[PDB]
């Protein structure tokens, strides 16, 4: 049988041109008033997955 | 393709039991016991090629030390005497000469006495 994607992972990652993965940052859902604007600004744009935790991502979504 | 292994195993066991020929009891008869004996034999054989070279040197040195003291010189002084006269003859032969040709040997002790 075909490998199943871990769908939850497929809904949090997206494959870029080179091979890396982009993802949204944590800490931007609730409890925002106490957080400085500078944090909330830096957490807004998407971010690349680190080389340490790339192998964990590559395995759990083997199609794209 | 099933593979019966009676022909090959026998040839493996029979090979080791051939090396264990001569050993006491199970050590010659019983593969499971012999195989240990044959490895241990290998281990001791390997170590004893090292110890043979030691033992014989002690043996020769004793012979030389014996044959020197008959002529009135100790081993320690004799060998320094020979080294100082640039004599290159080894223990193996000094020990051979000591036993066989003492009339010759005496000349080496005199040669050593010069130094």
């Amino acid at each position: 049988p075909k490998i199943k994607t871990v769908r939850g992972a497929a809904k949090r990652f997206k494959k870029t041109g080179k091979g890396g993965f982009k993802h949204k940052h944590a800490n931007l859902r609730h409890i925002l008033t106490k957080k400085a604007t500078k944090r909330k600004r830096h957490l807004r744009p998407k971010a690349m997955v680190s080389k340490g935790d790339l192998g964990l991502v590559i395995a759990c979504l083997p199609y794209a | 393709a099933r593979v019966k292994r009676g022909v090959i195993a026998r040839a493996r066991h029979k090979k080791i039991l051939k090396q264990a020929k001569g050993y006491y009891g199970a050590r010659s008869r019983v593969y499971r016991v012999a195989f240990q004996a044959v490895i241990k034999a290998g281990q001791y054989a390997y170590r004893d090629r090292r110890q043979r070279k030691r033992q014989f040197r002690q043996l020769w040195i004793a012979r030389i030390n014996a044959a020197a003291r008959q002529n009135g010189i100790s081993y320690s002084k004799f060998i320094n005497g020979l080294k100082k006269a640039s004599v290159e003859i080894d223990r193996k032969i000094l020990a051979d000469i000591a036993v066989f040709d003492k009339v010759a040997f005496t000349a080496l002790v005199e040669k050593a006495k010069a130094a």
Binding site: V6, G8, R12, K24, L56, V57, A59 | -
Partner: protein, 143 residues
């Protein structure tokens, strides 16, 4: 050449690791899987993305986006694969017969991927600004 004299290229075949066949084999007794623990066990090892009970990366990070239904039914036509249809007419049904875009694709777009020679009148199709310069530099008029 005879049926016996044939042989493969060097490096083609590579035997295969055979676990649990004595010391000399290298791997043998614990076939390269160490002493004890979950990973040594038959059927062992954890599932994918399991970090020892710490919240996994694919769960600590937030979910985002939505899948567009329109994006599934739109193609990116290569400008190199443009003059491979019917002289110089590339509507949609004509382009579909050339096996360049899928059957269920209504909208489509010609991008600048390089190289045109013949004049091609691109009808009923969205075209890029760089490709508009190329297609017209080759000869053909869009729409």
């Amino acid at each position: 050449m005879r049926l016996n004299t044939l042989s493969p290229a060097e490096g083609s075949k590579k035997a295969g690791k055979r676990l649990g066949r004595g010391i000399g084999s290298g791997l043998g007794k614990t076939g390269g899987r160490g002493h004890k623990g979950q990973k040594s066990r038959s059927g062992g090892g954890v599932r994918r993305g399991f970090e020892g009970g710490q919240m996994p990366l694919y769960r600590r990070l937030p979910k985002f986006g939505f899948t567009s239904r329109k994006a599934a039914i739109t193609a990116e036509i290569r400008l190199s694969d443009l003059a491979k249809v019917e002289g110089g007419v590339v509507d949609l049904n004509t382009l579909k017969a050339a096996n360049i875009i899928g059957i269920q694709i209504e909208f489509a777009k010609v991008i600048l991927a390089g190289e045109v020679t013949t004049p091609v009148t691109v009808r009923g199709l969205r075209v890029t600004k760089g490709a508009r310069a190329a297609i017209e530099a080759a000869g053909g008029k869009i729409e």
